[PDB]
Amino acid sequence: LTFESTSRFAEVDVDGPLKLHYHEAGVGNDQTVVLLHGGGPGAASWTNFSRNIAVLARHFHVLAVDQPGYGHSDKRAEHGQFNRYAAMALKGLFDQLGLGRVPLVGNSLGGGTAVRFALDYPARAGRLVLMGPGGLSINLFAPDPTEGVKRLSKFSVAPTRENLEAFLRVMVYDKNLITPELVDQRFALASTPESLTATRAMGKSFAGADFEAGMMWREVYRLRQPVLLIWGREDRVNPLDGALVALKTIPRAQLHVFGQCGHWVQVEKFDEFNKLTIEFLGGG
Amino acid sequence: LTFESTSRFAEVDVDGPLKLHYHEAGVGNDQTVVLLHGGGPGAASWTNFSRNIAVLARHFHVLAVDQPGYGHSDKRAEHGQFNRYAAMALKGLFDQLGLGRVPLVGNSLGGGTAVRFALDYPARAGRLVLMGPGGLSINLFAPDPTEGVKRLSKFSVAPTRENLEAFLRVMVYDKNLITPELVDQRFALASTPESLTATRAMGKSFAGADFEAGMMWREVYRLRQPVLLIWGREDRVNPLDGALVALKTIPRAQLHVFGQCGHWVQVEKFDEFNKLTIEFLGGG
Amino acid sequence: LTFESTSRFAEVDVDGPLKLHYHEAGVGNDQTVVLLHGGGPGAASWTNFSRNIAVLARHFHVLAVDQPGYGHSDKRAEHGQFNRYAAMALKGLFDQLGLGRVPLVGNSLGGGTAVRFALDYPARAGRLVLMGPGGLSINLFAPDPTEGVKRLSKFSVAPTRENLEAFLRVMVYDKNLITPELVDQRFALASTPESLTATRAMGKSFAGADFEAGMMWREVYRLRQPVLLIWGREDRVNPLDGALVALKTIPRAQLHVFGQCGHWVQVEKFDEFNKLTIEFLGGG
Amino acid sequence: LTFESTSRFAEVDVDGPLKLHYHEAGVGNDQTVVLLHGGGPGAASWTNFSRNIAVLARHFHVLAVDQPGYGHSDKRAEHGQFNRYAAMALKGLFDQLGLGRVPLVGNSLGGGTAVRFALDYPARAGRLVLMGPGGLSINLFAPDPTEGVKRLSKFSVAPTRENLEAFLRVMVYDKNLITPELVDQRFALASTPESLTATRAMGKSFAGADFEAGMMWREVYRLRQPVLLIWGREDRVNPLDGALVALKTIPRAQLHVFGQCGHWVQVEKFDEFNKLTIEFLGGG
Incomplete structure (x- = not known):
């Protein structure tokens, strides 16, 4: 399995044509699962789930x-x-x-x-x-914006390699995961005019009209499926107190918290995350 | 595997001779694990872990x-x-x-x-x-005694079948687990003069001198091993807010919470509990 | 000031004529304040706020x-x-x-x-x-229904003196406030056919398809005024964990919690309650 | 009342002579109260409590x-x-x-x-x-060190004007309280060789083998007096989740939380703070 072997495009209509890139693997297998990556500058599917997609x-x-x-x-x-x-x-x-x-x-x-x-x-x-999820999280104790969100905002205003490394370091418990190679690769993708344009567009999108659409903690009482919330105890972007409304109101909710783990559960606790996800989705 | 085939006794010295009963299984296997049951009237090892010991x-x-x-x-x-x-x-x-x-x-x-x-x-x-554990739990929101502890206390004062059924019903989310057969078997064991004597002795033991020994939330910051806390979201004896000091202070802690599950995780979520425990203890 | 001296009636229209009873005191004071009592069987304005109206x-x-x-x-x-x-x-x-x-x-x-x-x-x-308020409370830790709500429901199905006494005892920290006289007075008011009609109509409305309007924890981010939340730490009806979404989402919120106080803050902490309310509402 | 008019000195013995400076006011008032300031670089009694001592x-x-x-x-x-x-x-x-x-x-x-x-x-x-208190606080949700503690440590290693300004800005909800004059005054006091010696001695003591005496959340169940905990909802140094063990375990505890208020309750809510303290301590 490689980036190129799994690469696919589709065109869909969302107020006009929209090109979507995705990775496809396990074409033999009956149970389909869709993976949606985190939203840090330069993030994409293959790098977000590099420790997960093959397994x-x-x-x-x-x-x-x-x-x-x-x-x-x-x-x-x-x-x-x-x-x-x-x-x-x-x-x-x-x-x-x-x-x-x-x-x-x-x-x-x-x-x-x-x-x-x-x-x-x-x-x-x-x-x-859902790992350290946005939208259904509401930080009942942590003042907003969090340390993590403030470092993302600082990069949006001053998109330097130093501001990107600072944001990446508050996303993980083990700061050695933020290698010079990882910083250089994320920064090369994040700093393009096309990426910065998207990055800011996305910021502006969460304030004003349809802010209610982002307050999904108000709505998840209506979810009828089993939902596995997974959190890093040391998440500094979407902290653990953000899990409580969802855990209370989603009828078939579960929560797993990992000590010594920040915002990138799928990377920092890849083996435990993989086994939880395989069991929860029925082993396939 | 039967109660009788697995039954063992040992005599140990604890301010004089003390007979201990236990069940032994998997004698072929390298990794030993010790199972310690819940403390409701009439509880014992074989009935507490009937859905777990064979697996x-x-x-x-x-x-x-x-x-x-x-x-x-x-x-x-x-x-x-x-x-x-x-x-x-x-x-x-x-x-x-x-x-x-x-x-x-x-x-x-x-x-x-x-x-x-x-x-x-x-x-x-x-x-x-540790499933819905006593001792390291401190109910930061729930007034003490909880609904669950009050029903246990009522049985200690008035040991009737009706008071036992009432205590068993607040221990599970799915009240159909509290069958007439289960109530009759637990009540027959709980109502013996020897059991009632132990039941009350145990009550008296948690107040007075050495109450600090019961406040283990003060001490678990010193635990150096991985610790998997498991809770039922609807536990009415040791409620979920009791998990928070332990999750924060135990360095290598994890927490799993099951929605639609009370105080008997090992019974109510036996399959999920079994798989979590096998993986966490290294698969053996 | 007496029940009789302060007693007033008005006729208003809500799907037809509706007679409202109220108590009026302090006429000619510059600032008007409206008091709304709790919903236990036999509750009313004068008995709910007897330690408060005069002050x-x-x-x-x-x-x-x-x-x-x-x-x-x-x-x-x-x-x-x-x-x-x-x-x-x-x-x-x-x-x-x-x-x-x-x-x-x-x-x-x-x-x-x-x-x-x-x-x-x-x-x-x-x-x-707002004292131990319903609607904007959501018990993030306490399993619902709470011990307090369950005793209220038990009275509603079996409206006896003993079931009313049991419900009143989980309203207060100091159970000596639940005097034979209080039980007698409340039972007399709560067991009239008209009052039972109203309590049975209350049951159907809370589990009707109109339930969303009750989930005001979803909506209080819209409140623009200062809001003083007041809780008894030992509230067993609407426990303290129910304060957290409102405290987080109401911009100008304040919270005051009294130790050694249940659901009836205005009775069990009447002096401290009166003083907080007078200062918060601007001294009059 | 001025710094100079209220200034007093005493010599006491703690492993040898120790000069203490304090401010005295309201001499001849029946009730004595002792005020103890916070620990930010350049902090002292008079500047910490200038909006409070006179009142x-x-x-x-x-x-x-x-x-x-x-x-x-x-x-x-x-x-x-x-x-x-x-x-x-x-x-x-x-x-x-x-x-x-x-x-x-x-x-x-x-x-x-x-x-x-x-x-x-x-x-x-x-x-x-106790206002945003250290020692008896334990941040059950917030990863440690907090954003506030990290900015304090950064100043301690690189004691510049810019790092002090950054630490003072996470002390308050309204960042306009952090005036050039305030920064200048605090920087002047904090950057003396004697003050830096004291701040470096503070660092070693908090991570020495004497740390258990700092974990007062373990011990406050012993307090027999009424205790008023006061928190800014937006406290980024000792966040609100740090209140919960003390509120639960201190028998006669009360908690007051101010919305739109950070770590400096006595400055950002000076009037409400003064009034609460005067009433709680018995009006004098």
């Missing part, structure tokens, strides 16, 4: 989708509330691929997209696995 | 120990702080069986014993799996 | 309104979501009496009504004082 | 004590656990001035000292008012 593709038909604004998907300068935008694009892709009801796995912004998708198209989303 | 014994050398006051272990009318008493008995058994460092699995009172054991004899306890 | 009436023009279904207000057999029904009745009274923007003080059910009113008619509500 | 001195005999290492009190290069060191200094002052049982008001580091004092010398401490 999951042994069990499932994996569709890892670059969200609009990321990777090789289109990077429009203008769009509405991001999670609803991304959810509409994914729904376009489900229809094109002939999918019915499919489980979704999403970290951070991708968790927000997975939830918005499961609320807007309830019959299309099966079981959800 | 665990495929992977591990299982020692499921009737705590002093329960099952076929001695039921003294007088003893100190219960968890320290039970921990001293277990340590006597470890020495007799020639055990070094062994992981422990404990629900409720047994979780309290497992923790007291891991604090008092730190080199003898490996990984801990 | 508040030194500073404020006090209107203590019997909500529909309570005291001498009309006791209809059917209504929609209770808080919106009560808020529509209160709006009728505000219009009839010519009130502009008035601060509201509400405990439990009355706190829910005060919030529903402040959301639906934002220009008519000033500062809110 | 409190109308009701109380105020002693505002510069803790060892701050203001004009001695700045030793080495000491044990800071709160016990400061509590031993305060006991020396109490004995020297002939004080009996005195209520204590402390913010942050000073709240830790007030608690250590109330635990070690229980007959000498009355009612406690």
Whole structure:
């Protein structure tokens, strides 16, 4: 399995044509699962899930989708509330691929997209696995913006390698994961005019009209599927107190918390995350 | 595997001779694990872990120990702080069986014993799996005593079948698990003069001198092993808010919460509990 | 000041004529305040706020309104979501009496009504004082129904003196406040056929398809006024964990928690409660 | 009232002579109260409590004590656990001035000292008012170190004007309180060689083998007096989740949380803070 061997494009209609890039693996396997990556500058499907896609593709038909604004998907300068935008694009892709009801796995912004998708198209989303998710999180104790969100904002205003390394270091417990190679690769993708345009567009999208669409903690009481919330105890972007409304109100919720783990559970606790996800989605 | 085929006794010295009953299975397997049951009237090892012992014994050398006051272990009318008493008995058994460092699995009172054991004899306890545990739990939001503890107290004062059924119903989410057969079997064991004597002795043991020994949330910052806390979201005896000091202060802690699950995780979520415990203790 | 001397009636229109009873004191004081009582069987304005009306009436023009279904207000057999029904009745009274923007003080059910009113008619509500409030509370840790709600339901199905006493005992920290006289007085009011009709109508409304209007924790981010949340640490009906979403999402929120205090803050901490309310509402 | 008019010195003995500086006002008022300031670089009694001393001195005999290492009190290069060191200094002052049982008001580091004092010398401490206190706080949700503590450490390693400004900005909700004049005044006091010696001695003491005496969340169940915890909802140094163990375990605890308020409650909510403290301590 390589980036190039798994690479696919589709064109969907979201206020006009929208190119989506995704990775496909495990084509032999009956159970389809959709993977939605985190939203840090320069993030994309293959790098977000590099420790997961091969293991999951042994069990499932994996569709890892670059969200609009990321990777090789289109990077429009203008769009509405991001999670609803991304959810509409994914729904376009489900229809094109002939999918019915499919489980979704999403970290951070991708968790927000997975939830918005499961609320807007309830019959299309099966079981959800959500790692340090946006949208259904509401930090009952942590003052907003969090240390993590403030470092992301600083990069948006001053997109330097130093500001990117600072944001990456508050995303993990083990700061040695933030290697010079990782910083150089993320920064090369994040600093392009097309990426910076998307990065800011996405910021502006969460304030003003349709802010309510981002307050998904108000709505997840309506989810009827099993939902596995996964958190790093030391998440400094979407901290653990953000899990409590979702855990209380989602009828078939579970929560797993990992000590000595920040915001990148799928990287920092890859083996434990892989085994939880395989068991929760029925072993395939 | 039957109650009779697995039954064992040992005599240990705890302020004089103390008979301990336990169940042994998986004698072929290299990794020993000790199971410590919950403390409800009439509880014992075989009935507490009936959905777990056979599955665990495929992977591990299982020692499921009737705590002093329960099952076929001695039921003294007088003893100190219960968890320290039970921990001293277990340590006597470890020495007799020639055990070094062994992981422990404990629900409720047994979780309290497992923790007291891991604090008092730190080199003898490996990984801990603790389900709705006593002792390291401190209910930061729930007024004490909880609905669950009050129903246990009512049975101690008025040991009727009706008061026992009432206490059992607040221990599970799915009240159909509290069958007439289960109520009749627990009540027959709970109502014996020997059991009632132990039941009250144990009550009196948690107030007065050595109350600090029961406040293990003050001490678990010192635990150096991985610890898997497991809770039912709807636990009405040791509610979920009781997990937070332990999750914060134990360096290598994890937490799993099950929605639609009360105080008997090992029964109500037996399959998920079994798989979590097997993976966490290294698959054996 | 007596029940009789302060007693007033108004007729308002909510799907037809609705008689409201209220108590008026401190006439000619510059600032009007409306008090809304809790919803336990036999509750009413005068008995709910007897340790408060005389003191508040030194500073404020006090209107203590019997909500529909309570005291001498009309006791209809059917209504929609209770808080919106009560808020529509209160709006009728505000219009009839010519009130502009008035601060509201509400405990439990009355706190829910005060919030529903402040959301639906934002220009008519000033500062809110909410004591163990319903509606905007969501018990993130406590399994629902709570011990307090379960004892209320038990009375509703078997309206005996013993079941009322059991419900009143989980309302207070100091169970000596639950005197034979209090039990007798409340039982007499709660067991009339009209009062039972109202309590049975309350049950159907809370589990009808109108339930979303009750989930005011979803909506209080919209409140623009200062809001003083007041909780008994030992509240067993609406426990302290129910404060957290409102404290987080109301911009100008404050929270005060009293140790050694249950659900009846205005009785068990009457002096401290009076003093907080007088200062928060501007001294009068 | 001025810095100069209220300035007093005492010599006490803690492993040898120790000069303490304090401010005295309201002499001849029946009730003495001791104020203990927070621990930010350049902090001292007069600047910490300038919006409070004049008001409190109308009701109380105020002693505002510069803790060892701050203001004009001695700045030793080495000491044990800071709160016990400061509590031993305060006991020396109490004995020297002939004080009996005195209520204590402390913010942050000073709240830790007030608690250590109330635990070690229980007959000498009355009612406690603790604002965003250290020591008895344990951040159950917030990863440690907090954004606030990290900016303090950054100043300690690189004691520049820019790093001090960055630390002062996470102390307050309204960043306009952090004026060039405030930064200039604090930087001047914080960057003297004696003050840097004291701040470097503070660092070593908090990560020395004396750390257990700092974990006062383990011990405050012993406090017998009424304790008023006061928190800014937006506290980024000692965040609100740090209140929960103390609120649960102190028998006569109260908590007050101000929305739109950071770590400096006594500055950002000075009027409401003064009024709460005056009422709680008995009006004087």
